[PDB]
């Protein structure tokens, strides 16, 4: 047979309007039966209706006009694009409506994509079942035949026949649960709002709810009976944020109910389905005592993210997958925005600032690609799911929110959504909304497009001569060729004048060079206030010194953000070479008076990275000298740490940082205190509570003794707190018993005492420290086929593994070895971004040493 | 523009006498030279061609008229062009005056510095000419074939005791303060055995029969050369009795040179040794120490006949004397030093040769040498040991008495002349009366690589015998002397010469078990048809003492070897060794412990820890009684205390029962005593090993190594430090030793070897070799015995295709030379062979260890 469609995209010809879907899922037998009624509308004359289906045993297919007589239509198949074509026995005329009915049988998914299912072991030793969905991106067509593209928005009637013991859920509220004569229940849910096919949702599980009503909408967290006590905070928070987003966006959450569900499975699909927000149990659970600081921040973030998406993504969808970064970028921004507004106390701007640092690092590589690309096949569609894009977007919106007013941003947003509700959008449409709120004073589209269409970010260079501030732009490239790179850069700047004459302004650098006229002569100048702009700034020798000297006199004239920024940049610029590593260590000598966590963490991140690179070569004196030096600057702040959980989240994070550093390197009191804490804890059979802020540190010091290691392993297999288990595992993997380390990796690959999902984390941890450095990479090498079977070549896990196991190499010999090995696999494995990023990194490492290593001896 | 373009000198001119006058300064490394060569032309030739390198020719006169010099440094030659035609039969006198620098690389005429007991910068100088280094010290006809007589005279300072081949004739105090020693005219000898030593030494001489035997050590260390003397005396007698040809020179000096990089050579009358290899203490040295000193003295002594008296013509036949010295090394000991049980060493060494010779990397010992560097290749223990092995086969095939007569004759028939390997075989032809060919027989051994697999089948009163190449993965035919032994309790034994691919032997009686190759006197591994293995396997269980320890250990080795090549399943190998509960002989127990450690270490590296730990618990369960009986002393015969070290070192290594604790108890005492309270030398390494497992013990031992005087104790301390499970200390050891920081660069190879045998240091040792390749190559040149040992020690446990690919790739990226190198192709071969071992044997093990 011949197929009438030879394209990845569906034709514009026919358009869905309504969807009546009835399903009969049998979770114990992991199969289902389904019936779809699709009301379409033709626009062009056609003799075929091409839409999406996969893994469907089609029982009956019937076509209609109005004539209530169902006419038997023939169905064609083409598995390559997951398409089916319906041959209609009557031509379909423009404007005319038609209704298609399809009946089918299918399997509930073994994987955790599509309509997936699993079984869990209840608190009663009683084995239970559960089914859910995860359609993003291309998985709704697995669940039911449909038009599976974001632009084809329709309404949905969802009906499932469940079993009485189960709570069945879906997008909309439950219209009618009507008992069937055999012990089965035919649940019906109200007809949905005009929405995208990938956002359709349903869940069948034995579940409890915790509920509350906010204005009209009834928010509800559904958890498994045995863990409903742990979703209190979840709801409490979803209340605060829903309030906020509705107030911010000024468009009201369009449904009467909002459900969040803590799925009891680690591999589970977590996403922002309209009204049915899915999450991994793990990522929603919170105990107001027994949980961590990072624990609060994490779930508070994920709720925000998934909620922000309700408006940015579900109400205003992207026409196609090439604009995903816009919706995830927005969600990832509101993630941190909303949290400053409501959870100011969390200090999540600290996390956001780190994220941004980490993004820039990965973006500045040759391996990086622009966020705005042309996406054709299912591979390029799945390639669009990477935090780099999400985070670059996030960053670009902050740069835009800081350039225009806070209030200007909001009103563009408000206009954007309102104007485009229940429609499909292109990236530009957002910029156009920004264009109009600026009274055409800026372009924004022109401006943003320089960021979105180009890889990487610019390096701004700054020179002060009198009252003249000279700005220069250039692509921040790390040595290893074109000049089309020009970014429209919102430069902010801050200054101190005629004795504590604080001044600040902003100016657009749309050209390769320019000059700012300063109102008066200044002692120092700082560009990119709070690193709100996605760029690195380099300074002329005397301008750097102007900042290096200021930090020594009073660093508090600058924010913790700016101060962290300077610490980041100088170390990055030392890497490039535009500044000697000396100056880098010069700038950070101010640290004695630094009491804010952000700059201290960044200094620690920089110095631990250098330490480990040198450690891995034979240079152990330099490595030690480096650590004693840094310890000296932070001696007081370290000696000031109480081993507790008291203080603001920020200063709680400072404790975990300063204590880990000090313990890792066994400096002063640290080891002995943690060991006493460890012994006491072991002695309680682990029944004594340890302060969450000092847990990992304490556990590590423990694991350094067979007794400790053994007890920890014991507790890992016994206890039930997953987060405590991860902190426990970190310690085990931080041992210096090469044999133990090996065992831990072997075990996780065999899924033996640790599940395979933990493997990358084990490899990352082993590979970081000296006794397991070569071990970790050898394990990766020799177990390559078993790894690639267990995580597909292109998954995030395998990228994590390759990075984790190789990023600390810095010799031509290792470069040779690494390359060789992937060349010895195939050419398709050796062409993978993660393999090319790997080898780019080893080169940059080699280049780092052959630029900074020899001079090192003579200081620190 | 130069006449002679060839490696080997012209036949035409020939040396007779040498007037060698040297004025060497010890402080400055330079010397003034004068040689007068009295020659004789055998053809009428226009120019004299000889060897000379690194010489500034002051005056070159020919007699009384000056002659024009020419140079071709590529061949290391110089040409003297004669005024007249040198007419055949006529003697002429060639005299050269030259300047040159005293060597530092411990080759040619070398020297060094050392600090005294009183801590002073004393000097010393010496020679190492073999093969090609006389050319550098003095011009001459530097080939072994050209024998002559040597009058050497060296101008020395008053404080130095300058030595040479022949005894000192005179000494005249010059007007400068300087003393000029002259040494007697030498016997007719090859240029490469000419030697001279200038240094501040004491003597310990003791007449035997006119010829004065003397051990020359530095002043402070004269107390340890007593065993040395005692031993040379005994041995000298022996060889004079056995070879029945009196040691020619009036003197015999064994000098203990005060450096670890000195050259040890069998120079006629002036035997050079590394200080360490002769120093012995009857209280504080172990059995291996005692064997080592005894063995080496003998080796160099055997040479005074085999390689000095009777020399070889060209370098290719080196294996012969070297093999003979190596055999005599073990014979002499078995006759006079009988209690040392050194046959255990000879057997072991035989086995290890066998393993290296069983590779495609192997070369036949009778190759042709033409290349400047092919000469250096002839220096490898594989050629010396093979030679040794087959000399042994021959001794045992013919009579011990027949053997001797063939020797005595050859030495007489060839005294002071230059031979070829065939000449030894010729000398065997007549003692056999041309019954046995011998000459054609030995040629089947020496001209083709490897050795035979004699497969055996027994049916009634007859045993069937086929032979083939022993290849692990072509037609090779050896003339194999098959000694065998059978068993109402009828202990019958016989030989049979097999010269064809297939054979059959007739038996007097039908027999329970047969055992081919008695005491493994023959350089072949024997396989049996299934029920013949079981026959031997049963006997070992029933009563193993019907066979010798030698036979027993031979079986142990053969079955495991075969098991790798797949002619036997590994289960059957392990089945054989199940008799070990009844074994009280050290020979077998070591060979089993060796075999099982190799498997254990191969497994452990691949991560099969349980399988590896089941393996050692099995072997332990067999040797349980023995281990438990042993005392923590030195009380026992040399063989039995060799067993003490073996059993205790096994049991401690794997933390089995009694050991760890007992050894830690002896550690904690010794450490507390600040290292003074004596430790039995048989438990020492095992005591230190257990101690070095703590940061306390490790740091103490380190403090000792840098501080204590005994090198023998030091080497036991380093092996323990390198036995630490902390990758940081291991890395450090290799690092420190490369920069020569607290451990000389000489010890490096030993550290890398030790580090990469254990799990924490396995990837670390090889990584260090790759990352310091260039640096390793400067310290030890390509083809060095050290760099071969390094590439082996760090790669021999890699048993995966990924490793094999990596190892290859690495060397390829170095050079085509580096990549097409003996040890580099060998290493890769060994990896595949490990790979092949796994795919044959790994899957089965789960079910039966
Ligand atoms: C060549 O030189 C050697 C000596 O260098 C001569 O050999 C000596 O000859 C005499 C008799 O003429 C003997 O008594 C000596 O014993 C020989 N000494 C040695 C060391 O061999 C030889 O005769 C000379 N030949 C010619 C042709 O003049
Ligand atoms: C569901 O699983 C069965 C297992 O036999 C398989 O054969 C079939 O392909 C699946 N059903 C459909 C409609 O794909
Ligand atoms: C039928 O088509 C007309 C447009 O041609 C449209 O206005 C109407 O809403 C459609 N009705 C249904 C039920 O699809
Ligand atoms: C599924 O099938 C099983 C066994 O036939 C039955 O016990 C159960 O009630 C069914 N449930 C549903 C929801 O169809
Ligand atoms: C490096 O970047 C340039 C673009 O500036 C590109 O053409 C080239 O293919 C890149 N190479 C690699 C290995 O990424
Ligand atoms: C800076 O000042 C000069 C006059 O000195 C003027 O020409 C220029 O336009 C000024 N730039 C800005 C941005 O105001
Ligand atoms: C940190 O210290 C300085 C003075 O030493 C002070 O001005 C500043 O307020 C401190 N930081 C905070 C957050 O209190
Ligand atoms: C430690 O506590 C757990 C209960 O949480 C228990 O299962 C385990 O047996 C305890 N061990 C001892 C030795 O009391
Ligand atoms: C001695 O050494 C110097 C270099 O130190 C060298 O130039 C010279 O050729 C040597 N002299 C002789 C006579 O060999
Ligand atoms: C070696 O040279 C030094 C002076 O350079 C001198 O004191 C010593 O006597 C010399 N020895 C000889 C044997 O020439
Ligand atoms: C050293 O040699 C001389 C003879 O040259 C001898 O008289 C003396 O006894 C020897 N010294 C010793 C300690 O044997
Ligand atoms: C001692 O030397 C003489 C020759 O001077 C020799 O005849 C005799 O055989 C030798 N005796 C011994 C026992 O070696
Ligand atoms: C002595 O040597 C010659 C070869 O040079 C040999 O042919 C001859 O057979 C030998 N004679 C004896 C008696 O060993
Ligand atoms: C063995 O004996 C048989 C007669 O029983 C005889 O024919 C044969 O020649 C003998 N074989 C050998 C190798 O002596
Ligand atoms: C070993 O034991 C056997 C008896 O089983 C005995 O004949 C032999 O002498 C023993 N050997 C030693 C060295 O103990
Ligand atoms: C241990 O003894 C050695 C000499 O044997 C001495 O040098 C060292 O100082 C002693 N150690 C202590 C701690 O006194
Ligand atoms: N974008 C969703 C995750 C979807 C997962 C896609 N496989 C949140 O965040
Ligand atoms: N053939 C000697 C060793 C010679 C060493 C040459 N570098 C034995 O002993
Ligand atoms: Zn998202
Ligand atoms: Zn030798």
**What phi and psi values does residue A793 have, to the nearest 5 degrees?**
-65, 100
Domain boundaries along the sequence of chain A:
1-207, 208-456, 457-539, 540-860
Does the annotation list A96 as a binding residue? no
- Note the ligand closest to the C-alpha atom of A467: 6
Going B713 to B718 to B720 to B721, the CA torsion angle's sign is positive
State whether residue B697 is helix, strand or coil: helix
State whether residue B261 is helix, strand or coil: coil
CATH number of B451-528: 2.60.40.1910
CATH number of A540-860: 1.25.50.20
What end-to-end distance do the CA atoms of chain B give, in Å? 73
Cα of B448 to nearest chain A Cα, Å: 38
Cα of B235 to nearest chain A Cα, Å: 51
CATH number of A208-456: 1.10.390.10
Cα of A219 to nearest chain B Cα, Å: 53
Q: How many CB atoms lie within 10 A of CB A620?
A: 15
Q: Which of B300, B329, B583, B713 is catalytic?
A: B300
Q: How many whole angstroms separate alpha carbon A832 and alpha carbon B567?
A: 46
Q: How many whole angstroms separate alpha carbon A357 and alpha carbon A571?
A: 12
Contact B677, B640 (CB under 8 A): no
Residue nearest to atom 5 of ligand 11 (CA): B205
Are A817 and B809 a contacting pair at CB < 8 A?
Answer: yes
B673-687: burial string, b at 16+ Cβ within 10 Å, e else: eebeeebbbbbbbbb
A631 touches chain B (CB under 8 A): no
Angle at B409 between CA B403 and CA B412, to 5 degrees: 140
Q: How many CB atoms lie within 10 A of CB A104?
A: 20
Tell me, in angstroms, the distance from the centre of ligand 15 to residue B544's CA.
10
Q: How many CB atoms lie within 10 A of CB B16?
A: 15
Token couple for A60: 């009956």
Does the annotation list A665 as a binding residue? no
Q: How many whole angstroms separate alpha carbon B397 and alpha carbon B522?
A: 9
State whether residue B830 is helix, strand or coil: helix
With a CB cutoff of 8 Å and minimum separation 6, the contacts of B249 are B165, B166, B167, B187, B211, B268, B269
With a CB cutoff of 8 Å and minimum separation 6, the contacts of A851 are A577
Going B703 to B709 to B715 to B717, the CA torsion angle's sign is negative
Contact B718, B743 (CB under 8 A): yes
| Burial (CB count <10 Å: 0-12, 13-18, 19+), residue A236 | middle
CATH number of A457-539: 2.60.40.1910
Token couple for A136: 């993003």
Q: How many whole angstroms separate alpha carbon B694 and alpha carbon B725?
A: 10
CATH 3.90.280.10, applies to B529-849:
no
Peptide bond into B131 cis (omega under 30): yes
Test mutation, B655, B809, B834, B838, chain A, max A CBs within 10 A: B809
Tell me, in angstroms, the distance from the centre of ligand 1 to residue B253's CA.
30
Q: What CA–CA distances, in Å, run from A695 to A664, A668, A728?
A: 13, 19, 8
Contact B592, B571 (CB under 8 A): no
Q: How many whole angstroms separate alpha carbon A202 and alpha carbon A156?
A: 12
A741-759: burial string, b at 16+ Cβ within 10 Å, e else: bbbbbbbbbeeeebebebb
Tell me, in angstroms, the distance from the centre of ligand 1 to residue B16's CA.
9
Q: Long-range contacts made by residues A777-780, C-beta under 8 angstroms, separation at least 24?
A: A777/A805, A777/A806, A777/A809, A778/B763, A779/A742, A779/A745, A779/A746, A779/A805, A780/A805
What is the arrangement of strands in the sheet containing B77-86, beginning at the earlier edge strand?
Answer: B45-51, B77-86, B68-72
Tell the residue number behind the tokens 């649960």, with chain if given.
A177
Q: How many whole angstroms separate alpha carbon B378 and alpha carbon B370?
A: 11
The count of residues in chain B is 849
For residue B388, give the nearest of B453, B344, B305, B331 by alpha carbon: B331
Closest alpha carbon within chain A to B732: A618
Are A738 and B727 a contacting pair at CB < 8 A?
Answer: yes
What radius of gyration do chain B's Cα atoms show?
A: 29
Which ligand 4 atom sits nearest the alpha carbon of residue A24?
Answer: 14
Q: How many whole angstroms separate alpha carbon B36 and alpha carbon B55?
A: 15
| Chain A residues touching residue B726 (CB < 8 angstroms) | 736, 771
Contact B286, B249 (CB under 8 A): no
Q: How many whole angstroms separate alpha carbon A363 and alpha carbon B841?
A: 50
- Note the ligand closest to the C-alpha atom of B187: 1
Contact B555, B541 (CB under 8 A): no
Contact A558, A494 (CB under 8 A): yes
Q: How many whole angstroms separate alpha carbon A525 and alpha carbon A543?
A: 7
Angle at B768 between CA B765 and CA B772, to 5 degrees: 150
Can you say which residues of B are annotated as belonging to the binding site for Zn(2+)? Answer: 299, 303, 322
- How many contacts (CB atoms, under 8 Å) link A and B? 54
A255-265: burial string, b at 16+ Cβ within 10 Å, e else: bebbbbbbbbb
Query: Class of the A1-207 domain?
Result: mainly beta
Going A42 to A46 to A47 to A52, the CA torsion angle's sign is negative
For residue B473, give the nearest of B562, B360, B361, B561 by alpha carbon: B360
Q: Is the CB–ligand 12 distance for residue B209 below 6 Å?
A: yes
DSSP line for A607-636: HHHHHHHHHHTT-HHHHHHHHHHHHHHTHH
Are B726 and A746 a contacting pair at CB < 8 A?
Answer: no
Query: Class of the B1-201 domain?
Result: mainly beta
- Note the ligand closest to the C-alpha atom of A717: 8
Q: What CA–CA distances, in Å, run from B242 to A15, B210, B309, B323?
A: 110, 19, 15, 17
Angle at A447 between CA A444 and CA A453, to 5 degrees: 125
Q: Is the CB–ligand 13 distance for residue B726 below 6 Å?
A: no
State whether residue A351 is helix, strand or coil: helix
Q: Which helix (H) or strand (E) holds A263?
A: strand A257-263
Q: Given this chain, do its domains B202-450 and B451-528 carry the same CATH topology?
A: no
Residue A215, by phi and psi: left (phi above 0), alpha (psi -120 to 50) or beta? left
Residues of A marked as catalytic: 306
Q: How many whole angstroms separate alpha carbon A503 and alpha carbon B83?
A: 102
- Looking from the CA of A336 toward its CB, the CA atoms found within 13 Å total 23
Residue nearest to atom 27 of ligand 1 (CA): B90
Tell the residue number behind the tokens 């051990």, with chain if given.
B215
State whether residue A494 is helix, strand or coil: strand
Contact A238, A219 (CB under 8 A): yes
What is the distance of C-alpha A858 from the center of its chain? 42
Q: How many CB atoms lie within 10 A of CB A852?
A: 17
Residue nearest to atom 11 of ligand 13 (CA): B413
For residue A150, give the nearest of A32, A250, A43, A274 by alpha carbon: A274
B728 touches chain A (CB under 8 A): yes
State whether residue A502 is helix, strand or coil: strand
| Chain B residues touching residue A736 (CB < 8 angstroms) | 726-728
Q: Is the CB–ligand 9 distance for residue B502 below 6 Å?
A: no
Superfamily, domain B202-450 = Neutral Protease Domain 2 (1.10.390.10)
Contact A814, A842 (CB under 8 A): yes
Q: Long-range contacts made by residues B700-703, C-beta under 8 angstroms, separation at least 24?
A: B700/B671, B700/B675, B702/B742
| Chain B residues touching residue A771 (CB < 8 angstroms) | 726-728, 760
Tell the residue number behind the tokens 């000092």, with chain if given.
A694
Are A736 and B759 a contacting pair at CB < 8 A?
Answer: no
State whether residue A680 is helix, strand or coil: helix
Strands B211-217 and B251-257: parallel
| Burial (CB count <10 Å: 0-12, 13-18, 19+), residue B553 | buried
| Burial (CB count <10 Å: 0-12, 13-18, 19+), residue B109 | buried
Which ligand 18 atom sits nearest the alpha carbon of residue B307?
Answer: 1
Peptide bond into A137 cis (omega under 30): yes
Contact A238, A307 (CB under 8 A): yes
Closest alpha carbon within chain B to A735: B726
Cα of A738 to nearest chain B Cα, Å: 5
- Looking from the CA of B95 toward its CB, the CA atoms found within 13 Å total 12
Residue A302, by phi and psi: left (phi above 0), alpha (psi -120 to 50) or beta? alpha
What is the arrangement of strands in the sheet containing A458-465, beginning at the earlier edge strand?
Answer: A513-517, A468-475, A458-465, A536-539
Are B813 and A817 a contacting pair at CB < 8 A?
Answer: no
Q: How many whole angstroms separate alpha carbon B512 and alpha carbon B535?
A: 7
What radius of gyration do chain A's Cα atoms show?
A: 29
């Amino acid at each position: 047979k011949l197929f009438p469609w030879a394209q990845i995209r569906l034709p514009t010809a026919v358009v869905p309007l309504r969807y009546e879907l009835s399903l009969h899922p049998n979770l114990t037998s992991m199969t289902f039966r389904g019936s779809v009624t699709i009301s379409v509308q033709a626009l062009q004359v056609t003799w075929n209706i091409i839409l999406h289906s996969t893994g469907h045993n089609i029982s009956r297919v019937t076509f209609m006009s109005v004539s209530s007589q169902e006419k038997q239509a023939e169905i064609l198949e083409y598995a390559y694009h997951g398409q089916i074509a319906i041959v209609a026995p009557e031509a379909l005329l423009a404007g005319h409506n038609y209704t298609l009915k399809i009946e089918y049988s299918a399997n509930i998914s073994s994987s955790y994509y599509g309509f997936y299912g699993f079984s869990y072991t209840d608190e009663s030793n009683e084995k239970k079942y559960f089914a859910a969905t995860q359609f993003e991106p291309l998985a709704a067509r697995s669940a039911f035949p449909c038009f599976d593209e974001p632009a084809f928005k329709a309404t949905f009637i969802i009906k499932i026949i469940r079993d009485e013991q189960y709570t069945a859920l879906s997008n909309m509220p439950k219209k009618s649960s009507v008992v069937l004569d055999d012990g089965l229940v035919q649940d019906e849910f109200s007809e949905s709002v005009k929405m995208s096919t990938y956002l359709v949702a349903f869940i069948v599980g034995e579940m409890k709810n915790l509920s509350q009503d906010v204005n009209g909408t009834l928010v509800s967290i559904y958890a498994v009976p045995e863990k409903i006590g742990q979703v209190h905070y979840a709801l409490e928070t979803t209340v605060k944020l829903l309030e906020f987003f509705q107030n911010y966006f000024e468009i009201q959450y369009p449904l009467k109910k909002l459900d969040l569900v803590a799925i009891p499975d680690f591999e589970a699909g977590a996403m922002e389905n309209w009204g049915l927000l899915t999450f991994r149990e793990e990522t929603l659970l919170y105990d107001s005592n027994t949980s961590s600081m990072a624990d609060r921040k994490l779930v508070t973030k994920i709720i925000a993210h998934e909620l922000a998406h309700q408006w940015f993504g579900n109400l205003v969808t992207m026409k196609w997958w090439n604009d995903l970064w816009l919706n995830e970028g927005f969600a990832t921004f509101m993630e941190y925005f909303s949290l400053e507004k409501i959870f100011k106390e969390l200090s999540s701007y600290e996390d956001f600032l780190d994220a941004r640092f980490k993004t820039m690092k990965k973006d500045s590589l040759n391996s990086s690609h622009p966020i705005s690309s042309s996406v054709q096949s299912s591979e390029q569609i799945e390639e669009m799911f990477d935090s780099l894009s999400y985070f670059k977007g996030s960053s670009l919106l902050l740069m835009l929110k800081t350039y225009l007013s806070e209030d200007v941003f909001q009103h563009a947003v408000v206009l954007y959504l309102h104007n485009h509700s229940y429609a499909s959008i292109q990236s530009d449409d957002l910029w156009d909304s920004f264009n109009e709120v600026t009274n055409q004073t800026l372009d924004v589209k022109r401006m943003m497009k320089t960021w979105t269409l180009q890889k990487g970010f610019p390096l701004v260079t700054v020179q002060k001569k009198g009252k003249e501030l000279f700005i220069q732009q250039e692509r921040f490239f790390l040595n290893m060729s074109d000049t089309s790179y020009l970014w429209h850069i919102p430069l902010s700047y801050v200054t101190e004048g005629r004795n504590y004459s604080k001044y600040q302004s902003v100016s657009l650098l749309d050209k390769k060079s320019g000059v700012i006229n300063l109102t008066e002569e200044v002692l120092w100048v700082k560009v990119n206030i709070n690193m709100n702009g996605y760029y690195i700034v380099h300074y002329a020798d005397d301008d750097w010194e102007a900042l290096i000297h200021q930090l020594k006199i009073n660093p508090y004239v600058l924010s913790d953000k700016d101060r962290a920024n300077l610490i980041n940049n100088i170390f990055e610029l030392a890497g490039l070479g535009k500044v000697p590593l000396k100056r880098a260590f010069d700038l950070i000598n101010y640290l004695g008076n630094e009491n804010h966590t952000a700059p201290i963490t960044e200094a620690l991140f920089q110095t631990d990275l250098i330490y480990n690179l040198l450690e891995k070569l034979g240079y152990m004196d330099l490595a030690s000298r480096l650590v004693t030096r840094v310890f000296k600057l932070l001696q007081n702040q370290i000696q000031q740490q109480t081993w507790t959980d008291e203080g603001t989240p920020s200063m709680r994070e400072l404790r975990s940082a300063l204590l880990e550093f000090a313990c890792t390197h066994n400096l002063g009191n640290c080891s002995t205190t943690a060991m006493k804490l460890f012994d006491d804890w072991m002695a309680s059979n682990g029944t004594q509570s340890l302060p969450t802020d000092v847990m990992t540190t304490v556990f590590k010091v423990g694991a350094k003794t067979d007794k400790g290691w053994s007890f920890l392993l014991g507790k890992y297999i016994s206890i039930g707190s997953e987060a405590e288990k991860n902190k426990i595992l970190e310690a085990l993997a931080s041992s210096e018993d090469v044999r133990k380390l090996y065992w831990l990796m072997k075990s996780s690959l065999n899924g033996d005492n640790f599940r395979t999902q933990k493997l990358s984390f084990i490899i990352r941890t082993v590979g970081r420290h000296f006794p397991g450095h070569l071990l970790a990479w050898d394990f990766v090498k020799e177990n390559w086929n078993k790894l690639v079977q267990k995580f597909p070549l292109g998954s995030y896990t395998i990228q994590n593994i390759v990075a984790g196991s190789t990023y600390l190499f810095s010799t031509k010999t290792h470069l040779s070895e690494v390359q060789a090995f992937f060349e010895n696999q195939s050419e398709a494995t050796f062409r993978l971004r993660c393999v090319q990023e790997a080898l780019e990194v080893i080169q940059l490492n080699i280049q780092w040493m052959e630029k900074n290593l020899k001079s090192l001896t003579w200081w620190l």
